Design a protein around this nucleic acid. Structure first.
Length: 1129
DNA sequence: GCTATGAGTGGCCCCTGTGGAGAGAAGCCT
DNA sequence: GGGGCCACTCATAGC
RNA sequence: AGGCUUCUCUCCACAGGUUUUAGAGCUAGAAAUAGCAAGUUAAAAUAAGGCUAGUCCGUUAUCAACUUGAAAAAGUGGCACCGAGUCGGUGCU
């Protein structure tokens, strides 16, 4: 017969539960055939088990490294551009110069030219390293000198600047010329007093210079200034200007009594023209003061980093670094003298041992700055004359390096200034530099805009750029090849979610005029009013709706029901008393866009004509899409013909954010077949029907729901990957979803394809309903006689606290730490409870004590980075992997620790010994991930390359990670890699022991009635003998399968060493002890006070004579292979 | 007599620090 | 967290 | 409707780190070694490379075994009963 049955499911972060139950709450056991070459020709198993797999990983690392790769490629491109520019002139001075630079990383033997990269003779190298100890001295030389310079040195300077061109946080142009804060602040005071001599603010008594110098919050510095500034406050004009210079965004209308509201941020780029915007209102006199404020802002911003170079030069950064170097040398000499004078013994320790964290480790070792300061500080405290050094160390300025993490704040404008100064000074002697100043400067300043995206030629799945001319994109001609305009549209449109009712349609901007119309009219649909004499509330008439909208909504930005009752019914309809329902004291909808556009354009008839609707909608869309004004101006240029220049300029300034939820072709695109009206038209006037959006979509009287039904055609059957990709949540749970789907498919395959009646599901931490919907779509595919689905399979969602309280009430405790059966038991209880809401407890106990549970470790082909990235120094081994195809690791060192893609069993002959004699062998060979393509290209070739001979192709068995092997006495192992094995057996602890362990674990944390607590305490106290039984069972299981004789002896000694402790402590230490036999990699643990190192099974020989297992996703189908009989010696 | 093998056994090692722009969600508050 | 690698020590097989 | 925080996806940039090489160590001493001197920077790579040859792409996800397929994809293993330490036995077919 067709046994009525249902399948329970448990979906988690790392595992999937599966179980089959009858209506009688039993668990049937069935017999399954075995394929392969074994003799165990039939196996019977319970229809319950749990699946395991690794956690899915977010894409974040992949995205990071993709972006990094692109940055590196573009940096190399910039160097190549500079070298192409220099090439022809460089050919005359030194032909091999760029060759020397390229091959500089090879050893003396490998190089094709002279070994000194720069000059090719050692004498000039020493001269260069004497005259310029660091590159910054050369940069200063080229900044200041009027003498003709060697072309090679200038190339070095320019390349150094380009390859580290710094950040682009600041827009505009910073002026390092305004080096000193104090005099600029005095100029600000003078200009402020000239503007306001009636109420001067005293400069004396204000410590602006130091406070601006002192490292404090911008709000903190502003507060300190207000305390110092007499008769002044933050929102006051002078304090507002100071905050503007600091970086706060103050509004300026209150100071000048302006209708316009302008919150300017000086650093922000829009400030540069919005300043002229505001000065157009407030007159020209206020302009120069804002200029001085900008100067003060630049002064403080740069002085925070340049460390106040009083030396009058155009390139502060080089001077600052050179000053730091000089102070470093001075302090080094002084420290050497003092330490040699007072503590002769530690000289070698501090200054020779690379392993220490002293100066030797700080320079020739790997010690950072902080560790060196930490080591050196106490020594200074034991000596004399260390006052200055300790003060400097409190500044973090002792013996400082030059290439450190501080430079992460240097703005690129400084590098640009030095570049320009060089190109100006040296142009007189070198003509070709003069022609290329623009190009070189652009190379530094240019970058691909964030919204354009990668410059790909179609064949890149991440690209959206549109290319006009087939010229190669180069920074000099970027503008003429790609369109910034058309590009940006595509960049934005990738994300705007499609309309639900019309999946092929894009949603409109939230601030669309059509959107405002829709919201206003629809909210008016369900408004009812009661006047005297009216027995029932009346729907507002379409004529009334139109008149009210025209009179109030197009005249008032925010309208209350009070205004309606006072203005329309009262004044026009002569109803003094009206009772209105459906709106709470004000309309939620508002025609804000209408008022703004009428404010700017000032043509009401233009806004009132439907013939202009497309124009307005396009305008709103454009004003929402972009954020750079220039492209908006480009797009608005289409409508400059109907509008004057000032109106056009005002439009280019408003901005909107947010998107709507409905599509144009929905609200005003689809028409009713009967009348030709749109949803908007029906809302505006629908007779006595006065239907809302919900009514208009769910009513069959109009063809709208027909079109929507026609619109939601089921998409073409996608691969499971894209079904996974659409959902919302952590991708691991999506992995679990796919696993559960395949589990259901395979289980239906098992039961003779007779579909189950019910499905009970639970989920770990909406998407649950999505999983249920996917399952129901897969299962129920019968449409009834009326094209309605027949629900032969019901899917019910249940919550975890249900089963939790079900366990706690009937005392079927779970302990996650004893084994992995708990997933299967939770799934089975899920199914049973779900069926229950649609012998029993004896059956529950009988099932839960079953030792046979189907646990399968899902095999995985490891993918990811080829190996570790921390490049290691050279050393004599064959276990390092070259960084390039031609860089022998012995000479150059390189990578280490590859990750094995998988392993294949090898049966061949090998030349062994000094005599090169053939021995027939059979072992595991691991394919590295980096070699996967080569091996799957032609395995025979790759194997022959490894030295194996007479390769027998058919013998190759493909063994992923967590391949499973069978050994004597049921001992099992999982293949972690080619050389390490993990435990493959489970400790089956009977039910009563588990319950006792739970009770003892919470012995002082049990929660229940006090009578229940006393019952459970007494039950624990009665069965104290359980301690030794559990200990001995662990011992016996270890002796059979784990083989941890040293560890087992240590554990047994520890248990005897502490046998006299209370129950709860002993139980907690028991919980720790289960780690020894858990499935997976061995893990160390603490038992009372003794640490047990993890035992690693570091040999894989014993499986070469074992029986291999291949399991279905639940293992109900098995194909066992005996490896002993193939390739016998 | 000597060398080579591998088989443990213990112990150590693993790239990091940011900023900007955008879209969606989700959770909290008003 | 868990696998790769090294230093050490050493029984063991081989010769 | 609005404000703040957190999460996912994509793009743009920055600063380091590492590696090797270059930056003539000197003296005494056959050497071991001892003494002294100096110590802050630079070039290149930053998953091997691939072909569609782009200022593109390479660490996400998907894959037990057998037959049919380039792959997506398709097909491939009996039933009931009594028992239970990784599952056993009995009967029909």
């Amino acid at each position: 017969m067709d046994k009525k049955y249902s399948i329970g499911l448990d979906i988690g972060t790392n595992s999937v539960g599966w179980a089959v139950i009858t209506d009688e709450y039993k668990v049937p056991s069935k017999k399954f055939k075995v394929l392969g070459n074994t003799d165990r020709h039939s196996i019977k198993k319970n229809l319950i088990g749990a699946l395991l797999f690794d956690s899915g990983e977010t894409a974040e690392a992949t995205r990071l490294k993709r972006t990094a790769r692109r940055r590196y490629t573009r940096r190399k491109n910039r160097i190549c551009y500079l070298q192409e520019i220099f090439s022809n002139e460089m050919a005359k001075v030194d032909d091999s110069f760029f060759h020397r630079l390229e091959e500089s990383f090879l050893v003396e033997e490998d190089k094709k030219h002279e070994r000194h990269p720069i000059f090719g003779n050692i004498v000039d190298e020493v001269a260069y390293h004497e005259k310029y100890p660091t590159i910054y001295h050369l940069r200063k030389k080229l900044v200041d000198s009027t003498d003709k310079a060697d072309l090679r040195l200038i190339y070095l300077a320019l390349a150094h600047m380009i390859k580290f061109r710094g950040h682009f946080l600041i827009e505009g142009d910073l002026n390092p010329d305004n080096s000193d804060v104090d005099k600029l602040f005095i100029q600000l005071v003078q200009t402020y007093n000239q503007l306001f001599e009636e109420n001067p603010i005293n400069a004396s008594g204000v410590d602006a210079k130091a406070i601006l110098s002192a490292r404090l919050s911008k709000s903190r510095r502003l507060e300190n200034l207000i305390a110092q500034l007499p008769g002044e406050k933050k929102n006051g004009l002078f304090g507002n200007l100071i905050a503007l210079s600091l970086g706060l965004t103050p509004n300026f209308k209150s100071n000048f009594d302006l209708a316009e509201d302008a919150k300017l941020q000086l650093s922000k780029d829009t400030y540069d023209d919005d300043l002229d915007n505001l000065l157009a209102q407030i007159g020209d006199q206020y302009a120069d003061l804002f200029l001085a404020a900008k100067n003060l802002s630049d002064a403080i911003l740069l002085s925070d980093i340049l460390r106040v170079n009083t030396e009058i030069t155009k390139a502060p950064l080089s001077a600052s670094m050179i000053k730091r170097y000089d102070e470093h040398h001075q302090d080094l000499t002084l420290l050497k003298a003092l330490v040699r004078q007072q503590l002769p013994e530690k000289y070698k320790e501090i200054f020779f041992d690379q392993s220490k964290n002293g100066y030797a480790g700080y320079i020739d070792g790997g010690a950072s700055q902080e560790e060196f300061y930490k080591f050196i500080k106490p020594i200074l405290e034991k000596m004399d004359g260390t006052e200055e050094l300790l003060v400097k160390l409190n500044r973090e300025d002792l013996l400082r390096k030059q290439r450190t993490f501080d430079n992460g704040s240097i703005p690129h404008q400084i590098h640009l200034g030095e570049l320009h100064a060089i190109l100006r000074r040296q142009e007189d002697f070198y003509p070709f530099l003069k022609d290329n100043r623009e190009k070189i400067e652009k190379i530094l300043t240019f970058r691909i805009p964030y919204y354009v995206g990668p410059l790909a030629r179609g064949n890149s799945r991440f690209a959206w750029m549109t290319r006009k001319s087939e010229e190669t994109i180069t920074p000099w001609n970027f503008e003429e090849v790609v369109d910034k305009g058309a590009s940006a549209q595509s960049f934005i449109e990738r994300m705007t979610n499609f309309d639900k009712n019309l999946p092929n349609e894009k949603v409109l901007p939230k601030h669309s005029l059509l959107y405002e119309y829709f919201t206003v009219y629809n909210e008016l649909t369900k408004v009812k009013y009661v006047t005297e004499g009216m027995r029932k509330p009346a729907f507002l008439s379409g004529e009334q709706k139109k008149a009210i909208v025209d009179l109030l909504f197009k005249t008032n930005r925010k309208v209350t029901v009070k205004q309606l009752k006072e203005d329309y019914f009262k004044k026009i309809e002569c109803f003094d008393s009206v009772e209105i329902s459906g709106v709470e004291d004000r309309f939620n909808a508002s025609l804000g866009t209408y008022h703004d556009l009428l404010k700017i354009i000032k043509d009401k008839d233009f806004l009132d004509n439907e013939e202009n609707e497309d124009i307005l909608e396009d305008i709103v869309l454009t004003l929402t899409l972009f954020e750079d004004r220039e492209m908006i101006e480009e797009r608005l240029k289409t409508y400059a013909h109907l509008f004057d220049d000032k109106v056009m300029k005002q439009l280019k300034r408003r901005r909107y954010t947010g998107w709507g939820r409905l599509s144009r072709k929905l609200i005003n695109g689809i028409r009713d077949k009967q009348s030709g009206k749109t949803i908007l038209d029906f809302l505006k006037s629908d007779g006595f029907a006065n239907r809302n959006f919900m009514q208009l979509i769910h009513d069959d009287s109009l063809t709208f729901k027909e079109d929507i039904q026609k619109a939601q055609v089921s998409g073409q059957g996608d691969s499971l990957h894209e079904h996974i990709a659409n959902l919302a949540g952590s991708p691991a749970i999506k992995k679990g979803i796919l696993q559960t789907v395949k589990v259901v498919d395979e289980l239906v395959k098992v039961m003779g394809r007779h579909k189950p009646e019910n499905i009970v599901i639970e989920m770990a931490r909406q998407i649950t309903k999505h999983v249920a919907q996917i399952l129901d779509s897969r299962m129920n595919t019968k449409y009834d006689e009326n094209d309605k689905l027949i629900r032969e399979v019901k899917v019910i969602t249940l919550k975890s606290k249900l089963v939790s309280d079900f366990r706690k009430d009937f005392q079927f405790y779970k302990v996650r730490e004893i084994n992995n059966y708990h997933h299967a038991h939770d799934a089975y209880l899920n199914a049973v409870v779900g069926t229950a809401l649609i012998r029993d407890f004896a059956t529950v106990r009988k099932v839960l004590s079953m030792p046979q549970v189907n646990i399968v470790k899902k095999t995985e082909v490891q993918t990811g980075g080829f190996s570790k990235e921390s490049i290691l120094p050279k050393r004599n081994s064959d276990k390092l992997i070259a960084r390039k195809k031609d860089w022998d690791p012995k000479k150059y060192g390189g990578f280490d620790s590859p990750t094995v893609a998988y392993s294949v069993l090898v049966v061949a002959k090998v030349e062994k010994g000094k005599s090169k004699k053939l021995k027939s062998v059979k072992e595991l060979l691991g394919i590295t991930i980096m070699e996967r393509s080569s091996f799957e290209k032609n395995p025979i070739d790759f194997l022959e390359a490894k030295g194996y001979k007479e390769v027998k192709k058919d013998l190759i068995i493909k063994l992923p990670k967590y391949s499973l092997f069978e050994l004597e006495n049921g001992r099992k192992r999982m293949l972690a890699s080619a050389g390490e094995l993990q435990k493959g057996n489970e400790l089956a602890l009977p039910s009563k022991y588990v319950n006792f362990l739970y009770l003892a674990s919470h012995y002082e944390k049990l929660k229940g009635s006090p009578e229940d607590n006393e019952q459970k305490q007494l039950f624990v106290e009665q069965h104290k003998h359980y301690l030794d039984e559990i200990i001995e069972q662990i011992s016996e299981f270890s002796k059979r399968v784990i083989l941890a004789d040293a560890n087992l002896d240590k554990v047994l000694s520890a248990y005897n060493k502490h046998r006299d402790k209370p129950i709860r402590e002993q139980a907690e230490n028991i919980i720790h002890l289960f780690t020894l036999t858990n499935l997976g990699a061995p893990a160390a643990f603490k038992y009372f006070d003794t640490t047990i190192d993890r035992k690693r099974y570091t040999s894989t020989k014993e499986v070469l004579d074992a029986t291999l297992i291949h399991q279905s996703i639940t293992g109900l189908y098995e194909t066992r292979i005996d490896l002993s009989q193939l390739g016998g010696d």
